[PDB]
Amino acid sequence: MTTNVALVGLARDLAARAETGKPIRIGLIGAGEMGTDIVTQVARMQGIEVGALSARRLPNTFKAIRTAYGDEENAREATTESAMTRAIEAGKIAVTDDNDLILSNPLIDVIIDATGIPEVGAETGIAAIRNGKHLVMMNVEADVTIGPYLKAQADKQGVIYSLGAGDEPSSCMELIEFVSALGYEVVSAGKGKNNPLNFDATPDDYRQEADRRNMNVRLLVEFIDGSKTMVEMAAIANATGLVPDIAGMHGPRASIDQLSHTLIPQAEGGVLSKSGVVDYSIGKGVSPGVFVVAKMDHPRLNERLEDLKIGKGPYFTFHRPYHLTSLEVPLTVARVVLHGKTDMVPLPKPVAEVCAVAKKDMQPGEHLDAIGQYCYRSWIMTVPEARAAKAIPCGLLQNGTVIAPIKKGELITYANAAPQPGSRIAELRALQDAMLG
Amino acid sequence: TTNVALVGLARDLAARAETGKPIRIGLIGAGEMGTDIVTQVARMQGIEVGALSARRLPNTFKAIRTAYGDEENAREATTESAMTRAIEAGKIAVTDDNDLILSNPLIDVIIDATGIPEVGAETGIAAIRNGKHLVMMNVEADVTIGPYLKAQADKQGVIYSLGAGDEPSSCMELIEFVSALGYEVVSAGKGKNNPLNFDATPDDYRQEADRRNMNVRLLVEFIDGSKTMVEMAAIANATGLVPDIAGMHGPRASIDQLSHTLIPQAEGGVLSKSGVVDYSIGKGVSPGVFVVAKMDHPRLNERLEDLKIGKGPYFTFHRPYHLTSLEVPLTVARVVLHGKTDMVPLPKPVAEVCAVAKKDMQPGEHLDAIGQYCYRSWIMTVPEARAAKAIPCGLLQNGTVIAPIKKGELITYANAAPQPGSRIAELRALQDAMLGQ
Ligand SMILES: [Mg+2]
Ligand SMILES: [Mg+2]
């Protein structure tokens, strides 16, 4: 009709949900780019709606709705529960500047924080779970810091925790599930980037592109300096047991057609010390999307994949050549609510830690700024290596205090820096560490 | 073996293994596809081949020896009590009598891997009659009598599905995704590296078939387009997409050109309308399958452009692999564990696989078989096939020519008569009666 095709699978399940007259209802925190994308995407779908939308400043909620629909007719201001419930019952998106109204409204099935602020994702995440709501996490920086604790609390409450679909970590998990259900060895998994990283990048280098693209300069810097890649790969590690092969990963030069001879063991001509890793490639054809390199262990299976022109064995590349970011998150919401399935959760025992390296020399008393700025960049390590070094989890570091001189390129540790101790995020991480100890 | 924690369907299969009662497949046909399935299941958890049949008993032992290295796991059974005792002993029961498999109480799901459409029809209705789920690999049979099989499965309370891993069922994965997200499916299908040759015969391929120890008919039906017509018809008949013209356009297009080619003429492509099955000639599409989708909101167009998915409003979604028989056990797992089909025909077919003569023939000659000398498949809409009195291609093997036929001419009830006594002609008449109601 709009789609040109009969209803099948999840599309059919959503249509059946719509026919009940009670759609799945998202409580959406954050009316910026990702939130506006979600509102826009849900408007094309059946059986799923945004019940309520919050922003720090109320006008930005109306702006998001106007961008999605071309006018504000679907928006209705609500600053108490009775007003929010009435709005939703009237078929409106309740808009508010009070997150707690969304977190506690009885008609909201699932919470998504789209602010892009890890501390807010932590705060609203534990609130969602305490209110007995399912939680879909888009903030990967938060997830790699406190995900295991959120997941444990979600299980204590009988709700589902999941990373949202459409970002490299969760998209890669689709490939991992497929290869592993078939009983094949996962040799390496990850993402690519078209151009080399620049670990020295700062907002001075990108402020011009940011202005031109009307976007947050920090998103550019964390892209170029490797930080986002380190985070995303750690999320895959911590959901699978795959490990970085070396701190920071290898990040070799490899096009899509070269992965199966590069991100494999050194004994077989690759760069890896062992099989079972997260890594990434620099080169053409991989981004957007994600990959798994799998090994065949039976000569007949090798021959079938060679006859099918999948590669030359025993290593083969499985590529998902797209990820739609925000746009796929409603699919996670549907799977959670209709099927009781998560798309991606951390394991109970993390295997990797996102650590941080200084981008510049700093003296005691200076404050560390923020990811995507001037002072530091993320750096993946195994948990044992991070612990030996007393590395501070990168997610804790914004506005931290330097307590001993730090040189450009040096690891940020509990010997040379101190997080702001009063954050929900440092306080939740302490609880996670106690749970794990 | 996999290097990763159990997630999703893998986890579901491991939990099934822990019950001590695996999913049990009854496998009919010990040739190449059936040997692939025995080999693939051997590296999976929670799923086993309970029994294997062949026309000639020694081929069952040969399949098992190719899978395992020796024939140890095989045990001949000639009665139900022997078969059940063999399965309970951890053996693969082997026989030359399909009915022993079809009626054994320990068998959960039947798969016919013989590659013979008539046998797929016969064993499929028998599997349903016996209250077993049915996974169909024979697409030639499915596009002939699939609707009837699906209706009879519904009456018995069992599940009918095409097996995963072939172009039609792989494409349905993409169609599900795009349509769940509410996007317009413009075109869907597969690719071929080189131009079709409609005049190909076994003489052109017998040398390569001998060299590769393979059936020459598989090569001829690939080259002459027959398999492509069948696979696109299966997608059509599961979705309501239609060939835009008899035989489809089959334009030259690489993977990067699909989104400007298999789109409407008004927008610079070749199609008369949106919502089709078609195929491309050129690089980078094969192996696997595509959907070209259209965006209907400028923000969603912008997002996909920013992600470098394409230049809008048309975008290509590619699954760059499909593993043939190796994925079929995933269909078995989803059917038995989750009650989900991977692919079913709609109740009302929209496309018919018809046939065209490859050479002049005179009355009294017999038509031979697909992949040989006399005829090739040719997709048509159902209304055009009806109007022309076209015979469904699946009925034609060993049919009688009853009026002169020229090279390139459609095979119709006016110029040929199918063998009337086949299970496939009989079941097709039943389907036509059911559709008349
Ligand atoms: Mg990402
Ligand atoms: Mg095929």
* Distance set, CA B312 to CA A418, B267, B295 (Å): 48, 11, 7
Instruction: Locate the chain A residue with the closest alpha carbon to B273.
Output: A4
Q: Report CA torsion sign: B67, B73, B76, B79.
A: negative
Residue A55 · residue A80 · CB < 8 Å: no
Query: Cα(B242) to centroid of ligand 1, in Å?
Result: 36
Q: How buried is residue B390: exposed, middle or buried, by Cβ count under 10 Å (0-12/13-18/19+)?
A: buried
Rounded distance, CA A423 to CA B14, Å? Answer: 40
Distance CA(A30)–CA(A50), nearest Å, equals: 12
* Bridge partner list, A417: A402
> CA–CA separation, B286 vs A310, rounded Å?
9
Q: Give every CB contact of residue B53 below 8 A, 6+ residues apart in sequence.
A: B26, B27, B28, B29, B30, B60, B94, B95, B96, B97, B98, B100, B101
| CA dist., res. A54 & res. A51, Å (int) | 11
Beta pairing partners, B271: B264
> What is d(CA A54, CA A78) in angstroms, rounded to the nearest whole number?
10
Known binding-site positions of A: 167-168, 232
Indicate if the alpha-carbon torsion angle B82, B83, B87, B91 is positive or negative.
Answer: positive
**B107-144 exposure pattern, b = at least 16 Cβ within 10 A, e = fewer:** bbbbbbbbbbbbbbbbbbbbbbebebbbbbbbbbbbbb
Distance CA A142, CA A148 (A): 10
For residues A110-125, b (16+ Cβ closer than 10 Å) or e, as one string?
bbbbbbbbbbbbbbbb
* Helices and strands, counts by H and E, chain A: 16, 16
How far apart are the C-alpha atoms of A245 and A262, rounded to whole Å? Answer: 13
| B186 touches A at CB < 8 Å | yes
CB A190 within 8 A of CB A279: yes
Contact at CB, B2 and A179, closer than 8 angstroms: yes
Is the peptide bond preceding residue B58 cis, with omega within 30 degrees of 0? no
Q: Which residues of A touch B208 (CB under 8 A)?
A: none
Strands (E), B96-241: 109-112, 133-136, 160-162, 184-192
Identify the CA nearest to B294 among candidates B318, B275, B319, B272.
B275
Question: Residue A76, by phi and psi: left (phi above 0), alpha (psi -120 to 50) or beta?
Answer: beta
Residue B19 tokens read as 């019950």
Cis bond leading into A265, ω under 30°? no
Reference A98, options A135, A61, A67, A55; nearest CA is A55
Tell me if B90 sits within 8 A of B22, measured CB to CB.
no
Q: Please, which residues 66-125 of chain B have a Cβ atom closer than 8 Å to chain A?
A: 66-67
| Contact assessment for residue B280 and residue B253, using Cβ atoms and an 8 Å cutoff | yes
Within 8 A by CB and 6+ apart from A126, the residues are A150, A153, A424, A428
**Rg, chain A, Cα only:** 22
Query: Best interface-test mutation with B: which of A1, A2, A4 has the largest number of B CBs within 10 A?
Result: A4
Scan residues 226-245 of B and list those with Cβ closer than 8 Å to A. Answer: 238-241
* Tokens standing for residue A314: 């025993």
Query: Please, are residues A95 and A54 in contact by the beta-carbon 8 Å criterion?
Result: yes
Check: CB of residue A348 under 8 Å from CB of residue A198: no
What DSSP assignment string belongs to B402-432? -S-B-TTPBPBTTTEE--TT-HHHHHHHHHH
Confirm or reject contact between B255 and chain A (CB < 8 A).
no
Distance separating alpha carbons of residues A275 and A272, to the nearest angstrom: 7
How near does any CA of chain B get to the CA of A258, in Å? 15
Using DSSP, state whether B137 is helix, strand or coil: coil
Distances (CA, A) of B299 to A39, A289, A327, B306, B313: 11, 20, 11, 10, 11
The residue among A47, A235, A207, A55 whose CA lies nearest residue A137 is A235
Residue of B nearest to A38 (CA): B300
How far does CA B240 lie from the centroid of its chain?
17
Q: Tokens for A150?
A: 């959120």
CB-neighbour burial class of residue A374 (10 A; exposed 0-12, middle 13-18, buried 19+): middle
| Residue entry with tokens 């929670």 | B46
How far is the CA of B370 from the CAs of B200, B222, B225, B384, B394, in angstroms?
11, 10, 11, 22, 9
Check: CB of residue B158 under 8 Å from CB of residue B131: yes
Taking the C-alpha atoms of residue A22 and residue A111, their distance in angstroms, rounded to an integer, is 17
What token pair was written down for A266?
């050194």
| Distance, CA of A1 to CA of A373 (rounded, Å) | 47
Q: Are B79 and B22 in contact (CB under 8 A)?
A: no
Q: Which amino acid is at A261?
A: H
- Please state, in angstroms and rounded to a whole number, the distance separating the CA atoms of residues B44 and B133: 20
- Single-letter residue type at B163: G
Query: Which DSSP symbol is given to A244?
Result: E
Q: Residue A275 corresponds to which tokens in the numbers above?
A: 């099989």
B325 interaction partners in chain A (CB closer than 8 Å): 304
3-class secondary-structure state, position A150 = helix
Scanning every residue of chain B, which has its alpha carbon at the shortest distance from the alpha carbon of A242?
A: B4
Cα–Cα distance, A141 to A293 (Å, whole number): 25
Q: Which of B13, B300, B318 sits opposite A327 (nearest CB)?
A: B300
A180 Cβ under 8 Å from any chain B Cβ: yes
SS3 for A28?
A: strand
How far apart (Å, rounded) are the C-alpha atoms in residues B110 and B177?
Answer: 28
Please give the Cα distance from A378 to B274 (Å, whole number).
Answer: 46
Distances (CA, A) of A215 to A32, A56, A61, A295, A396: 10, 18, 18, 41, 24
For A358-388, the three-class secondary structure string (H helix, E strand, C coil) is: ECCCECCCCECCCCCCCCEEEEEEEHHHHHH
Residues from chain B that touch A330, judged by Cβ atoms under 8 A, are: 181
Note if the bond before B313 is cis, omega within 30 degrees. yes
| Residues ≥6 apart with Cβ < 8 Å to A28 | A35, A38, A39, A50, A52, A53, A54, A102, A112, A114
Distance A183 CA to ligand 2 centre (A): 23
Instruction: Compute the Cα dihedral for B191, B193, B194, B200 and give only its sign.
Output: negative
Partner-chain contact B43 A322, CB within 8 Å: no
The span from the CA of B401 to the CA of B409, in Å, is 13
The binding site of A for Mg(2+) comprises 167-168, 232
User: Hey, what long-range contacts does A202-210 have (CB within 8 A, 24 or more apart)?
Assistant: A202/A359, A202/A373, A202/A374, A203/A372, A203/A373, A203/A374
Q: State the Cα–Cα distance between residues B30 and B40, nearest whole angstrom.
A: 14
Burial class of residue B348 (count of CB atoms within 10 Å of its CB; 0-12, 13-18, 19+): exposed
Residue where the block lists tokens 């489809």: B248
Task: Determine the 3-state secondary structure of A29 from DSSP.
Answer: strand
Give distance in angstroms: CA of B231 to centre of ligand 2. Answer: 7
How crowded is residue B307: how many other Cβ atoms within 10 Å of its Cβ?
Answer: 18
| Cβ B126 vs Cβ B153: under 8 Å | no
Reading the block at residue B437, the tokens are 């109601």
- CA–chain centroid gap for B129, Å, is 22
CB of A324 closer than 8 Å to CB of B303: yes
- Residues ≥6 apart with Cβ < 8 Å to A41: A326, A327, A329, A330, B181, B182, B300
Which residues face B294 on adjacent strands?
B184, B314
Matching residue, tokens 């094309």: A44
Token representation of residue B168:
């039609």
CA of A347 to the centre of ligand 1 (A): 20
Q: How many angstroms separate the CA of residue B260 from the nearest CA in chain A?
A: 18
Distance of CA A34 to the CA centre of its chain: 12
Q: Give per-residue burial for A50-83: e unless 16+ CB within 10 Å, then b.
A: bbbbbbeebebbbbbbebbbeeeebbbebeeeee
Residue A327 has phi, psi (to 5 degrees) of: -65, -30
The number of C-alpha atoms within 13 Å of A353 and in the hemisphere containing its C-beta is: 24
- Residues with Cβ within 8 Å of A176's Cβ and at least 6 positions away in sequence, in order, are A186, A189, A236, A240, A292, B4, B7
Q: What is the DSSP secondary structure assignment for residue B391, as one 8-state letter?
A: P
Resolution at which this structure was determined, Å: 1.5
**Touching check for B13 and chain A: CB below 8 Å?**
yes
Per the annotation, where are the binding residues of B for Mg(2+)?
166-167, 231
Q: Who among A5, A180, A276 is closest to B239 (CB)?
A: A5
> Judging by beta carbons within 10 Å of its beta carbon (0-12, 13-18, 19+), is residue B203 exposed, middle or buried?
exposed
ω before B243 within 30° of 0 (cis)?
no
Report CB contact under 8 Å: A239, B5: yes
AA letter at A176: I
Inter-CA distances, A158 with A109, A155, A165, B12, Å: 13, 5, 21, 20
3-state helix, strand, coil in chain B (%, to 5): 40, 20, 40
Ion ligand 1 — residues with CB under 5 Å?
Answer: A 167-168
How far is A146 from B404, CA to CA, in rounded Å? 77
- Three-state DSSP class for residue A405: coil
Both tokens of B218, joined, read 């598989």
Contact criterion met (CB below 8 Å) for A237 and A243: yes
Other residues' Cβ atoms within 10 Å of the Cβ of residue A158? 9
Q: How far apart are CA A232 and CA A236, in angstroms?
A: 7
Give CA torsion, residues A121, A124, A125, A131, to 10 deg: -170
Q: List, as one string, the DSSP characters of A304-318.
A: HHHHTTS-SSSEEEE
* Contacts A–B by Cβ distance under 8 A: 187
Tell me phi and psi for residue A387, to 5 degrees.
-65, -40
- Residue B230 sits at the vertex; the CA angle it makes with B226 and B232, to the nearest 5 degrees, is 115
Q: How far is CA A221 from CA A231, A297, B312, in A?
A: 14, 42, 27
DSSP line for B22-42 = -EEEEEE--SHHHHHHHHHHT
Measured distance CA(A46)–CA(A23) in Å, rounded:
8
Eight-class DSSP state of A78: -
Specify the 3-state DSSP secondary structure of A167. coil
Among residues A394, A144, A410, A385, which one has the least CA distance to residue A249? A385
Spatial separation of the C-alpha atoms in residues B34 and B21, rounded to whole Å: 22
Residues A234-251 as b or e (16 or more Cβ within 10 Å = b): bbbbbbbbbbbbbbbbbb
Q: Please give the Cα distance from A147 to A350 (Å, whole number).
A: 9
Distance separating alpha carbons of residues B143 and B227, to the nearest angstrom: 12
Question: Beta-carbon neighbour count of residue B25 at 10 Å?
Answer: 28
